[PDB]
Write a protein that binds this ligand. Sequence first.
Ligand code: CLA
Ligand code: CLA
Ligand code: CLA
Ligand code: CLA
Ligand SMILES: CC1=C(C#C/C(C)=C/C=C/C(C)=C/C=C/C=C(C)/C=C/C=C(\C)C#CC2=C(C)C[C@@H](O)CC2(C)C)C(C)(C)C[C@H](O)C1
Ligand SMILES: CC1=C(C#C/C(C)=C/C=C/C(C)=C/C=C/C=C(C)/C=C/C=C(\C)C#CC2=C(C)C[C@@H](O)CC2(C)C)C(C)(C)C[C@H](O)C1
Ligand SMILES: CC1=C(C#C/C(C)=C/C=C/C(C)=C/C=C/C=C(C)/C=C/C=C(C)/C=C/C2=C(C)CCCC2(C)C)C(C)(C)C[C@H](O)C1
Ligand SMILES: CC1=C(C#C/C(C)=C/C=C/C(C)=C/C=C/C=C(C)/C=C/C=C(C)/C=C/C2=C(C)CCCC2(C)C)C(C)(C)C[C@H](O)C1
Lengths: 90, 175, 172, 180
Amino acid sequence: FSPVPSPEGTKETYWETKAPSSDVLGIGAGVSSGNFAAASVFAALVGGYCTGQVIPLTVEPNPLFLAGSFLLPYSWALHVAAWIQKNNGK
Amino acid sequence: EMSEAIPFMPKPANIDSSMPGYAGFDPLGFTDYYSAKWMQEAEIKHGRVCMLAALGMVFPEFAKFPQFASFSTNPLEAFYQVSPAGWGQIFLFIGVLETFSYEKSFYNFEGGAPGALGFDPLRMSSNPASAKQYAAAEVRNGRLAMIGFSGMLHHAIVSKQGPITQIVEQNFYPK
Amino acid sequence: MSESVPFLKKPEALDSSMAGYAGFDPLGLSSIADIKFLQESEIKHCRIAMLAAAGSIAQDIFTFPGVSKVVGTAKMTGVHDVLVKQGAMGQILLWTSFLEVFGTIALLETLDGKRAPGDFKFDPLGFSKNAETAKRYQLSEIKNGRLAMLATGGMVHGYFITGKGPLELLTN
Amino acid sequence: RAVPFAPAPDCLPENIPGYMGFDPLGLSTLCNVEWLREAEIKHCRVAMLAAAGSIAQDLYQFPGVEKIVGSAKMTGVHDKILAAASTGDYKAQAMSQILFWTSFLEIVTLPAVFETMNGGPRKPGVFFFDPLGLGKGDKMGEMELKEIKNGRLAMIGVGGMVHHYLLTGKGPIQFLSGIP
Ligand code: CLA
Ligand code: CLA
Ligand code: CLA
Ligand code: CLA
Ligand SMILES: CC1=C(C#C/C(C)=C/C=C/C(C)=C/C=C/C=C(C)/C=C/C=C(\C)C#CC2=C(C)C[C@@H](O)CC2(C)C)C(C)(C)C[C@H](O)C1
Ligand SMILES: CC1=C(C#C/C(C)=C/C=C/C(C)=C/C=C/C=C(C)/C=C/C=C(\C)C#CC2=C(C)C[C@@H](O)CC2(C)C)C(C)(C)C[C@H](O)C1
Ligand SMILES: CC1=C(C#C/C(C)=C/C=C/C(C)=C/C=C/C=C(C)/C=C/C=C(C)/C=C/C2=C(C)CCCC2(C)C)C(C)(C)C[C@H](O)C1
Ligand SMILES: CC1=C(C#C/C(C)=C/C=C/C(C)=C/C=C/C=C(C)/C=C/C=C(C)/C=C/C2=C(C)CCCC2(C)C)C(C)(C)C[C@H](O)C1
């Protein structure tokens, strides 16, 4: 009803193709699909290891294993980005 | 035309002699409503999983892997004796194989043959007659394994043992 | 193709004109983060590490009058643990943070492109007047800073494992 | 050609180093050929380092390693060094150092394997490591055949050495000399 503002640099992300354009990856638009797929497997293994090593949680957990355990959900978004980049020819 | 499986019923229009395990058997017409190629690939995939499942329900009667040698020969107890790390690795492996059928069916549905995941390492099906025979043999052995696994599963439910054990002990009936 | 890493491809965001260019970006992190942000971050790390490497060395060589009374034997990281209890670490943090507040403004100007990455125009003595000596000296600042980054970690980890400190580790 | 009964798949080209027509199980069709080729070259090298390592460690010990090792052979040393590292020994972090550095080399070279699959100029298994320049000075492609062939030999040899160790405590040099 009035012009709705968006932050500067907002671009069009609506897609009907096989994969969205790489611009939906934001800062990760130029990363290769191999680099996401390898980062995804690396993040899944190190995140799963770091998660697994502190499953009995103590009052003294290792802070590096806690922070490294966040790589498991991050790996999900990484392999989705790997799929998007392979289907954009990157 | 009439069905070859049911000679009093008319031929189901969307199934054809081209398909490997065709018998004219669609009394309730799934293919006139669902995609015949989707049903074809789905039948083939159920059969391939069931063929491994039939072999897998029967095989720990004979021998077990040394790590799971302590596990039970009843398959429905050996299901729970496997660790969730083991089932997670099995699920990750099956998922990796499925990534290929996700492409073959949700994106590349029309290009090829149903169930053709590019898995022919010993280069069979090169001879055309041999290819025809193997296609029909895969579909029929898959259906047979579906029936056989269904049997052996419910037989393991009633009598808490493997099918071969139930046979040799002659525990064929609910007791 | 790349100069430093012959098998990998030339990094797309990296150019010969930029100081300390060896075409070295194997993970392609220049695509992920803005290159001007990365360049300023590297220069900030280079200068803080250069001061820190020389710092460790100088503190082993000698201390300032009275510091030895305040910290009995701790060196490298250990003296920092003593100085948070005193006021030295906090006072340096307050002043470095105050300069970094203007640095935040400068970083915003760099992201705009108004200001060169890491260029705070600090020349009390003009040793970059030539403008080719400036190119060389910026390359030297980047190279000595990268070396100092490595070195600072190296000597601090030597303190973590042995407690000797940088010069003392060689002497002992 | 290697197996007359079952020849190599047409997926395998004939102009690759070490091509002698051996693929009876047709494993090339299942996975990308470039990924498989680099996987073999990487296995060749890791195995060659292990085979030469297994022989050399039995043949010679660096000064002072004997006290931590005790009497462990090629497989045993790895367990002994990790056990002492578990205690907290600074000297027993050798395994961690090689794991960190081999991992760092793999992490930096991570993009390279995908770039070869993507169609990049790099051929699988080539990192342009020629400080000696022996291949550049001579003709390249004959040592590539030697590297794949010796690597395959080493792959099998490392398996021989380890399984011989597990059955009988003797390492490589000792096992070759003795004949149980
Ligand atoms: C639907 C299939 C299915 C499922 C869900 C299971 C599930 C299970 N099996 Mg059973 N099993 C299967 C098939 C299956 N198996 C088959 C086909 C065999 C015969 C080889 C066996 C033989 C078997 C034994 C001997 C044992 C199990 C055991 C187990 C348990 C642990 C996992 C394990 O070791 O599996 C092992 C399963 C396999 C190795 C099957 C792999 C199937 C792959 C996908 C087919 C291979 C494709 C082909 C060969 C590729 C060739 C390429 C070419 C170049 C050669 C778990 C309950 C253990 C247990 O606890 O039992 C008490 C155990 O000791 N399984
Ligand atoms: C009776 C079984 C049987 C038969 C005849 C076929 C036939 C076929 N398959 Mg299929 N398949 C089967 C089982 C079978 N498959 C199972 C169980 C799986 C799951 C692991 C698969 C998975 C599969 C995939 C993923 C693909 C095929 C494909 C093909 C086709 C081309 C390859 C070919 O000619 O192989 C011929 C195969 C045989 C002659 C089977 C013989 C196997 C050996 C010799 C005997 C079984 C050994 C057993 C493991 C040991 C038993 C131990 C016990 C007796 C003690 C052809 C239609 C490909 C295709 O393009 O389809 C159109 C394809 O993409 N299949
Ligand atoms: C990252 C840098 C860094 C850090 C955190 C420290 C931290 C510390 N130093 Mg070390 N030091 C440094 C660099 C550093 N130093 C350098 C470069 C030298 C060589 C001159 C020394 C020599 C030195 C001695 C000899 C002694 C310390 C001591 C100390 C402690 C007390 C503070 C003090 O008196 O410092 C004094 C440090 C200086 C007077 C020199 C640093 C001045 C630099 C050049 C400031 C420049 C900032 C720069 C201009 C910012 C640019 C802004 C831009 C936006 C324009 C504390 C642990 C004492 C200690 O605990 O010893 C055990 C001590 O006795 N420092
Ligand atoms: C028989 C051994 C052998 C041969 C012929 C080659 C041949 C080749 N390699 Mg490979 N390589 C090998 C082993 C070998 N490699 C091993 C074990 C490693 C692991 C360290 C590597 C790691 C490697 C990398 C990382 C790269 C190559 C590259 C190359 C090419 C460069 C040509 C050249 O100058 O190499 C000539 C090499 C030799 C003549 C081998 C010399 C072996 C001598 C005898 C030293 C042995 C020392 C050993 C530790 C002691 C063992 C004895 C002990 C038991 C007593 C060529 C295709 C490069 C490439 O393909 O890109 C252009 C490349 O990037 N190779
Ligand atoms: C594709 C491909 C190839 C391949 C391959 C592979 C791995 C092929 C695998 C084929 C397999 C595993 C086939 C297994 C079928 C099992 C059946 C039909 C069992 C049915 C059970 C029944 C009827 C029952 C029952 C029971 C009932 C209910 C009551 C019980 O009391 C008793 C009883 C036991 C009688 C290769 C690798 C060669 C390469 C080539 O280039 C391409
Ligand atoms: C490439 C490159 C560079 C480099 C480099 C390097 C490091 C090159 C290193 C090359 C090496 C180390 C090659 C070694 C291969 C080992 C083999 C073939 C052993 C197989 C085992 C067998 C046969 C066995 C066995 C055994 C059995 C199982 C039981 C045992 O009990 C006994 C027994 C022994 C009989 C340089 C710097 C030159 C530059 C150049 O520009 C590029
Ligand atoms: C924690 C703590 C404190 C502290 C502190 C400090 C000062 C912590 C600083 C830690 C630092 C700076 C660590 C640096 C690590 C650098 C590495 C691993 C790079 C290695 C090189 C590699 C991998 C490869 C290099 C390579 C080589 C070899 C050849 C190939 C190419 C190349 C890439 C050049 C205090 C002061 C607060 C006290 C407090 O009570 C506790
Ligand atoms: C470190 C560590 C360990 C370890 C470990 C290691 C290093 C384990 C290494 C295992 C390896 C490398 C096994 C490979 C064996 C080679 C085989 C089976 C080739 C067979 C030949 C065939 C099939 C046919 C060959 C044929 C013939 C006839 C000749 C022509 C060619 C061909 C036709 C192909 C543990 C696990 C003990 C843990 C422990 O905590 C510490």
